[PDB]
Short mmCIF file of all heavy atoms in Angstrom, two decimals:
data_model
loop_
_atom_site.label_atom_id
_atom_site.label_comp_id
_atom_site.label_asym_id
_atom_site.label_seq_id
_atom_site.Cartn_x
_atom_site.Cartn_y
_atom_site.Cartn_z
N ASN A 51 -235.43 137.87 -100.29
CA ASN A 51 -235.01 138.77 -99.21
C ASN A 51 -235.74 138.71 -97.88
O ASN A 51 -235.80 139.70 -97.15
CB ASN A 51 -235.00 140.21 -99.72
CG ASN A 51 -234.07 140.39 -100.88
OD1 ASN A 51 -232.88 140.09 -100.78
ND2 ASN A 51 -234.60 140.88 -101.99
N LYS A 52 -236.30 137.55 -97.54
CA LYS A 52 -236.97 137.40 -96.26
C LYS A 52 -235.84 137.15 -95.25
O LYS A 52 -234.94 136.34 -95.50
CB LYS A 52 -237.93 136.21 -96.31
CG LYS A 52 -238.49 135.78 -94.96
CD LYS A 52 -239.38 136.85 -94.36
CE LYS A 52 -239.95 136.38 -93.03
NZ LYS A 52 -240.98 137.32 -92.51
N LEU A 53 -235.87 137.87 -94.13
CA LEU A 53 -234.87 137.74 -93.07
C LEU A 53 -235.36 136.83 -91.96
O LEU A 53 -236.50 136.93 -91.50
CB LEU A 53 -234.51 139.11 -92.51
CG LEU A 53 -233.65 139.96 -93.45
CD1 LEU A 53 -233.97 141.42 -93.23
CD2 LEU A 53 -232.16 139.65 -93.24
N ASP A 54 -234.48 135.94 -91.52
CA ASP A 54 -234.80 134.96 -90.50
C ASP A 54 -233.82 135.05 -89.33
O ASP A 54 -232.63 134.84 -89.52
CB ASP A 54 -234.74 133.56 -91.15
CG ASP A 54 -235.12 132.44 -90.21
OD1 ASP A 54 -236.18 132.55 -89.54
OD2 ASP A 54 -234.38 131.43 -90.14
N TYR A 55 -234.32 135.36 -88.13
CA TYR A 55 -233.48 135.44 -86.93
C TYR A 55 -233.17 134.03 -86.42
O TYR A 55 -234.08 133.29 -86.01
CB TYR A 55 -234.17 136.24 -85.83
CG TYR A 55 -233.25 136.55 -84.67
CD1 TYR A 55 -232.33 137.61 -84.75
CD2 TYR A 55 -233.24 135.75 -83.52
CE1 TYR A 55 -231.42 137.85 -83.72
CE2 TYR A 55 -232.32 135.99 -82.48
CZ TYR A 55 -231.42 137.04 -82.59
OH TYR A 55 -230.54 137.31 -81.57
N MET A 56 -231.90 133.65 -86.42
CA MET A 56 -231.48 132.31 -86.00
C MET A 56 -231.20 132.13 -84.51
O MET A 56 -231.56 131.12 -83.91
CB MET A 56 -230.25 131.88 -86.80
CG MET A 56 -230.52 131.82 -88.30
SD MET A 56 -229.05 131.55 -89.30
CE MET A 56 -228.72 129.80 -89.00
N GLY A 57 -230.54 133.10 -83.91
CA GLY A 57 -230.23 133.00 -82.51
C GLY A 57 -229.06 133.88 -82.15
O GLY A 57 -228.62 134.69 -82.95
N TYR A 58 -228.55 133.70 -80.94
CA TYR A 58 -227.43 134.49 -80.47
C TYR A 58 -226.66 133.80 -79.35
O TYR A 58 -227.04 132.74 -78.86
CB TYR A 58 -227.92 135.85 -79.96
CG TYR A 58 -228.71 135.78 -78.66
CD1 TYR A 58 -228.11 135.36 -77.47
CD2 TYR A 58 -230.05 136.15 -78.61
CE1 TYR A 58 -228.81 135.32 -76.27
CE2 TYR A 58 -230.77 136.12 -77.41
CZ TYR A 58 -230.14 135.71 -76.25
OH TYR A 58 -230.82 135.69 -75.04
N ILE A 59 -225.57 134.45 -78.95
CA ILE A 59 -224.72 134.02 -77.85
C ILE A 59 -224.33 135.35 -77.21
O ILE A 59 -223.79 136.24 -77.87
CB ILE A 59 -223.48 133.22 -78.34
CG1 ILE A 59 -222.79 132.56 -77.15
CG2 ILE A 59 -222.48 134.14 -79.06
CD1 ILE A 59 -221.84 131.44 -77.53
N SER A 60 -224.62 135.50 -75.93
CA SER A 60 -224.31 136.74 -75.26
C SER A 60 -222.88 136.85 -74.75
O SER A 60 -222.04 135.96 -74.93
CB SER A 60 -225.27 136.97 -74.09
OG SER A 60 -224.98 136.10 -73.01
N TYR A 61 -222.63 137.98 -74.10
CA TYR A 61 -221.35 138.30 -73.52
C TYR A 61 -220.97 137.20 -72.53
O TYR A 61 -219.79 136.87 -72.38
CB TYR A 61 -221.48 139.64 -72.79
CG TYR A 61 -220.25 140.08 -72.03
CD1 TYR A 61 -219.07 140.37 -72.69
CD2 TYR A 61 -220.28 140.21 -70.63
CE1 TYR A 61 -217.94 140.78 -72.00
CE2 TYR A 61 -219.16 140.62 -69.93
CZ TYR A 61 -218.00 140.91 -70.62
OH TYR A 61 -216.88 141.33 -69.95
N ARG A 62 -221.99 136.63 -71.89
CA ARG A 62 -221.80 135.59 -70.88
C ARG A 62 -222.07 134.18 -71.38
O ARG A 62 -222.32 133.28 -70.59
CB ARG A 62 -222.68 135.90 -69.67
CG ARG A 62 -222.60 137.36 -69.25
CD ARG A 62 -223.43 137.71 -68.02
NE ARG A 62 -222.66 137.61 -66.78
CZ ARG A 62 -222.31 136.46 -66.21
NH1 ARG A 62 -222.65 135.31 -66.77
NH2 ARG A 62 -221.61 136.46 -65.08
N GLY A 63 -222.01 133.98 -72.69
CA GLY A 63 -222.23 132.66 -73.24
C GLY A 63 -223.67 132.17 -73.37
O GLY A 63 -223.91 131.16 -74.02
N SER A 64 -224.62 132.85 -72.74
CA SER A 64 -226.02 132.43 -72.84
C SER A 64 -226.40 132.35 -74.32
O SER A 64 -226.11 133.26 -75.09
CB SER A 64 -226.94 133.44 -72.15
OG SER A 64 -226.76 133.44 -70.75
N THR A 65 -227.05 131.27 -74.71
CA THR A 65 -227.47 131.13 -76.10
C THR A 65 -228.98 131.07 -76.20
O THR A 65 -229.67 130.77 -75.23
CB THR A 65 -226.89 129.87 -76.79
OG1 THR A 65 -227.23 128.71 -76.02
CG2 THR A 65 -225.39 129.98 -76.93
N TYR A 66 -229.49 131.37 -77.39
CA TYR A 66 -230.91 131.33 -77.66
C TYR A 66 -231.11 130.99 -79.13
O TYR A 66 -230.57 131.67 -80.00
CB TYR A 66 -231.59 132.66 -77.39
CG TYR A 66 -233.02 132.64 -77.89
CD1 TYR A 66 -233.96 131.78 -77.32
CD2 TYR A 66 -233.41 133.43 -78.98
CE1 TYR A 66 -235.25 131.71 -77.81
CE2 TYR A 66 -234.71 133.36 -79.48
CZ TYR A 66 -235.63 132.49 -78.89
OH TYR A 66 -236.92 132.41 -79.35
N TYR A 67 -231.91 129.97 -79.39
CA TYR A 67 -232.14 129.56 -80.75
C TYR A 67 -233.58 129.70 -81.17
O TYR A 67 -234.50 129.58 -80.36
CB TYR A 67 -231.72 128.09 -80.91
CG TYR A 67 -230.30 127.84 -80.51
CD1 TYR A 67 -229.96 126.72 -79.75
CD2 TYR A 67 -229.29 128.70 -80.91
CE1 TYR A 67 -228.64 126.48 -79.38
CE2 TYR A 67 -227.97 128.48 -80.55
CZ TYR A 67 -227.65 127.37 -79.79
OH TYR A 67 -226.33 127.15 -79.46
N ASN A 68 -233.78 129.96 -82.45
CA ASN A 68 -235.12 130.05 -82.98
C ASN A 68 -235.64 128.61 -82.92
O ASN A 68 -235.05 127.70 -83.50
CB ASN A 68 -235.09 130.52 -84.44
CG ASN A 68 -236.46 130.85 -84.97
OD1 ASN A 68 -237.44 130.17 -84.66
ND2 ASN A 68 -236.54 131.90 -85.78
N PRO A 69 -236.75 128.37 -82.20
CA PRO A 69 -237.35 127.04 -82.05
C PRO A 69 -237.35 126.23 -83.35
O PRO A 69 -237.23 124.99 -83.32
CB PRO A 69 -238.76 127.37 -81.59
CG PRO A 69 -238.53 128.54 -80.72
CD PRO A 69 -237.58 129.39 -81.52
N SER A 70 -237.48 126.92 -84.48
CA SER A 70 -237.52 126.28 -85.79
C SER A 70 -236.20 125.64 -86.21
O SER A 70 -236.18 124.83 -87.13
CB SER A 70 -237.98 127.27 -86.86
OG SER A 70 -237.02 128.28 -87.06
N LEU A 71 -235.10 126.01 -85.55
CA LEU A 71 -233.79 125.45 -85.87
C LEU A 71 -233.31 124.55 -84.73
O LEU A 71 -232.44 123.70 -84.92
CB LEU A 71 -232.76 126.56 -86.09
CG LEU A 71 -232.75 127.42 -87.36
CD1 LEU A 71 -234.03 128.20 -87.50
CD2 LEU A 71 -231.59 128.38 -87.29
N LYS A 72 -233.89 124.77 -83.55
CA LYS A 72 -233.57 124.06 -82.31
C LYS A 72 -232.64 122.84 -82.37
O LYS A 72 -231.55 122.85 -81.79
CB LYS A 72 -234.85 123.65 -81.59
CG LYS A 72 -234.61 123.21 -80.15
CD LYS A 72 -234.03 124.37 -79.33
CE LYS A 72 -233.40 123.89 -78.03
NZ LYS A 72 -234.36 123.17 -77.14
N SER A 73 -233.07 121.80 -83.06
CA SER A 73 -232.28 120.57 -83.15
C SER A 73 -230.98 120.64 -83.96
O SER A 73 -230.02 119.94 -83.64
CB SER A 73 -233.16 119.44 -83.70
OG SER A 73 -233.71 119.79 -84.97
N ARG A 74 -230.95 121.48 -84.99
CA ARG A 74 -229.78 121.57 -85.88
C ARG A 74 -228.76 122.68 -85.64
O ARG A 74 -227.69 122.66 -86.24
CB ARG A 74 -230.26 121.71 -87.32
CG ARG A 74 -231.39 120.80 -87.71
CD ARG A 74 -231.69 120.96 -89.19
NE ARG A 74 -232.32 122.24 -89.52
CZ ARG A 74 -231.94 123.02 -90.53
NH1 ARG A 74 -230.92 122.66 -91.30
NH2 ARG A 74 -232.60 124.14 -90.78
N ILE A 75 -229.08 123.64 -84.79
CA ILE A 75 -228.19 124.77 -84.58
C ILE A 75 -227.36 124.78 -83.31
O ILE A 75 -227.68 124.12 -82.33
CB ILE A 75 -228.99 126.10 -84.67
CG1 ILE A 75 -228.05 127.30 -84.67
CG2 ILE A 75 -229.98 126.18 -83.52
CD1 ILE A 75 -228.76 128.64 -84.84
N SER A 76 -226.28 125.53 -83.36
CA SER A 76 -225.38 125.72 -82.23
C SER A 76 -224.53 126.93 -82.56
O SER A 76 -224.00 127.06 -83.67
CB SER A 76 -224.51 124.47 -81.99
OG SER A 76 -223.72 124.14 -83.12
N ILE A 77 -224.44 127.84 -81.61
CA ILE A 77 -223.65 129.04 -81.78
C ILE A 77 -222.64 129.00 -80.66
O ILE A 77 -223.00 128.91 -79.49
CB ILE A 77 -224.50 130.32 -81.62
CG1 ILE A 77 -225.51 130.41 -82.76
CG2 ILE A 77 -223.59 131.54 -81.60
CD1 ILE A 77 -226.44 131.58 -82.66
N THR A 78 -221.36 129.08 -81.03
CA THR A 78 -220.29 129.03 -80.06
C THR A 78 -219.36 130.22 -80.24
O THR A 78 -219.25 130.79 -81.33
CB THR A 78 -219.49 127.71 -80.20
OG1 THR A 78 -219.03 127.56 -81.55
CG2 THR A 78 -220.37 126.51 -79.86
N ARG A 79 -218.70 130.59 -79.16
CA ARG A 79 -217.77 131.71 -79.16
C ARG A 79 -216.35 131.18 -78.97
O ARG A 79 -216.14 130.01 -78.60
CB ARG A 79 -218.11 132.68 -78.02
CG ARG A 79 -218.25 132.03 -76.64
CD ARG A 79 -218.53 133.07 -75.55
NE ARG A 79 -218.66 132.48 -74.22
CZ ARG A 79 -218.86 133.18 -73.10
NH1 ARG A 79 -218.93 134.50 -73.13
NH2 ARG A 79 -218.97 132.55 -71.94
N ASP A 80 -215.38 132.05 -79.24
CA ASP A 80 -213.96 131.75 -79.08
C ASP A 80 -213.34 133.11 -78.79
O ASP A 80 -212.86 133.78 -79.70
CB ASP A 80 -213.36 131.16 -80.37
CG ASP A 80 -212.00 130.51 -80.14
OD1 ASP A 80 -211.20 131.06 -79.35
OD2 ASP A 80 -211.73 129.46 -80.76
#
C-alpha cells in the first residue's frame, strides 16, 4: 500500500512527471 505520485496534466495541458519515471511516462488528454 505505498502510494507513488506519477504526475499530472493541467487544465492547460501543462504536464509534470515524477523524475523517477521521466523517461518512460507520458500523460495526455483528449
Side-chain angles (χ1 to χ4, degrees):
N51 300 304
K52 169 65 179 188
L53 287 149
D54 183 49
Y55 190 80
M56 299 172 74
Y58 70 65
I59 191 162
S60 73
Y61 176 64
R62 315 182 92 286
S64 292
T65 55
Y66 171 65
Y67 304 136
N68 190 322
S70 68
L71 286 61
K72 194 62 197 301
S73 57
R74 316 185 289 133
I75 188 176
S76 59
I77 294 177
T78 55
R79 52 177 180 177
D80 195 321

